[PDB]
Design a protein around this ligand. Structure first.
Ligand SMILES: NC(=[NH2+])NCCC[C@H](N)C(=O)O
Ligand SMILES: NC(=[NH2+])NCCC[C@H](N)C(=O)O
Ligand SMILES: [Cl-]
Ligand SMILES: [Cl-]
Ligand SMILES: [Cl-]
Ligand SMILES: [Cl-]
Ligand SMILES: [Cl-]
Ligand SMILES: [Cl-]
Ligand SMILES: [Cl-]
Ligand SMILES: [Cl-]
Length: 129
């Protein structure tokens, strides 16, 4: 599944991400756009043998277990494969733990580089949520 912008905004609002840890909904939609292009199935391999999974590109070194990553911690207590569902529940629950862990949304490099600093409210504009 690839989400549309307003469809994803709607789903993330349903899951309680609007203002989660102080981050307005547009932050989360922008993060998904530049992390995964709204693609629930996307994966990306890294040089440290970890992999980024799903719509928020959650990484296997710290957050989920994929049975193939060195120095893994599985802080979200979830198999990485669960983050490749077309249903965003597991990714949101993991994201809430990541953003609460103490560095906010800076955890997402694409967000830090291509969303932070811009007017993120524009990502939910016209969605009439
Ligand atoms: N700023 C924009 N309008 N971006 C395009 C997003 C449109 C989105 N995929 C939708 O149908 O809701
Ligand atoms: N992604 C960045 N580093 N942006 C820096 C400047 C962004 C600019 N203030 C804006 O409204 O979008
Ligand atoms: Cl895509
Ligand atoms: Cl897995
Ligand atoms: Cl592993
Ligand atoms: Cl969903
Ligand atoms: Cl979950
Ligand atoms: Cl980036
Ligand atoms: Cl917003
Ligand atoms: Cl809203």
């Amino acid at each position: 599944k690839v989400f549309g912008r307003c469809e994803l905004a709607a789903a993330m609002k349903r899951h309680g991400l609007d203002n989660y840890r102080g981050y307005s909904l547009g932050n989360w939609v922008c993060a998904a756009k530049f992390e995964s292009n709204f693609n629930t199935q996307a994966t990306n391999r890294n040089t440290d043998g970890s992999t980024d999974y799903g719509i928020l590109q959650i990484n296997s070194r710290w957050w989920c277990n994929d049975g193939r990553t060195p120095g893994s911690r599985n802080l979200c207590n979830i198999p990485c494969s669960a983050l490749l569902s077309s249903d965003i529940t597991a990714s949101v629950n993991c994201a809430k733990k990541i953003v609460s862990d103490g560095n906010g949304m800076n955890a997402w490099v694409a967000w830090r580089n291509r969303c932070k600093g811009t007017d993120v409210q524009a990502w939910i504009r016209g969605c009439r949520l």
